[PDB]
Design a protein around this ligand. Structure first.
Ligand SMILES: C[C@@]1(O)OC[C@H](O)C1(O)O
Ligand SMILES: [Cl-]
Length: 321
């Protein structure tokens, strides 16, 4: 091995704290840290901003952390600080939301844009059919992950659902209050809207709540991505019939596991490599091209979760995160 477990520390950084998705991801990363005998600190800003993330990243670098695992608010905004981390000899991973691939080594991904876009579209089309007015409602027009998925989803919709119109795209800024206001405004301005597609953990519950507040629940289809602990009662009331995610606790755990392989065990992971992690399953390192990127380099790539999850009333109580 390259190191001893007790001498290392890893930083697990969310887009922001105080959102169930991120708390649960952090719990998974920390639990795996405990299982491996390595220290993992979960911390980040309380609002989603590039400058906030840069401040935390700089602090972790300056405290001589061995690895950073970040879900990014930006494609390029973290580049300078992540490059500084790499130069210091730190291992830089992303999870959830990627950065420019040259600025990290591995991205621990919940799925490709095609996988996730097809999920959003299929969950919607099962409920509204091939004709309707739809809106997209998510965090921000610049965040890496959601824009990768939505760009793909819009491409698929234009071709495969020519009788859908995307009437609007709105942003809730990872903020519950803003998201509720925006969601209510969608219903007030487009009272005949058929579905709102919400690939953001804050926008989706806000949209469900907006529908309930305005007595449009069960008239408008609301689907997207969020955590089951946040969505459970909306599903049981029937306001949301189905929505998607993936095991975010295992995602955080996988990030810690990979950091441990690299930093403690001294493994040199390459595209094409594969391994198994108990409680997660078999995973492999894929090229950056699976995300649409044009960059490849030795020891750089994407590790995708084996499965995603579609939650309905039939399985909502099978998941705790
Ligand atoms: C769950 C999600 O869609 O919302 C916040 C996360 O960063 C996410 O994965 O994009
Ligand atoms: Cl619905």
């Amino acid at each position: 091995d390259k190191k001893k477990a007790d001498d290392v520390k890893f930083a697990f950084i969310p887009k922001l704290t105080g959102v169930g998705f991120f708390t649960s991801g952090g719990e998974g990363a920390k639990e795996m840290g405990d299982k491996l005998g390595v220290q993992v600190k979960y911390d980040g800003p309380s609002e989603a901003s590039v400058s906030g993330q840069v401040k935390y990243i700089n602090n972790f670098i300056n405290q001589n952390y061995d690895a950073l695992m970040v879900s990014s608010t930006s494609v390029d905004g973290l580049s300078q600080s992540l490059q500084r981390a790499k130069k210091k000899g730190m291992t830089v991973l992303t999870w959830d939301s990627d950065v420019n691939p040259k600025d990290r080594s591995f991205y621990i991904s919940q799925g490709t844009p095609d996988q996730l876009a097809n999920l959003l579209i299929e969950m919607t089309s099962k409920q509204i059919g091939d004709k309707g007015k739809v809106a997209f409602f998510y965090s921000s027009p610049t965040v890496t992950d959601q824009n990768q998925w939505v760009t793909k989803a819009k491409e698929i919709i234009k071709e495969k659902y020519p009788n859908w119109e995307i009437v609007t795209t709105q942003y809730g800024e990872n903020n519950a209050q803003k998201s509720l206001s925006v969601g209510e405004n969608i219903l007030k301005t487009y009272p005949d809207i058929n579905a709102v597609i919400c690939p953001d953990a804050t926008a989706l519950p806000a949209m469900a709540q907006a529908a309930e507040n305005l007595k449009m629940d069960k008239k408008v289809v609301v689907t997207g991505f969020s955590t089951p602990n946040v969505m459970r009662d909306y599903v049981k009331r029937g306001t949301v019939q189905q929505f998607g995610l993936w095991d975010v606790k295992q995602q955080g755990a996988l990030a810690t596991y990979v950091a441990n392989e690299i930093v403690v065990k001294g493994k040199k992971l390459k595209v094409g490599d594969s391994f198994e992690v108990k409680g997660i399953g078999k995973v492999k390192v894929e090229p950056n091209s699976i995300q649409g990127y044009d960059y490849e380099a030795e020891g750089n790539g994407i590790i995708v979760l084996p499965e995603r999850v579609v939650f309905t009333k039939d399985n909502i109580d099978k998941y705790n995160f």
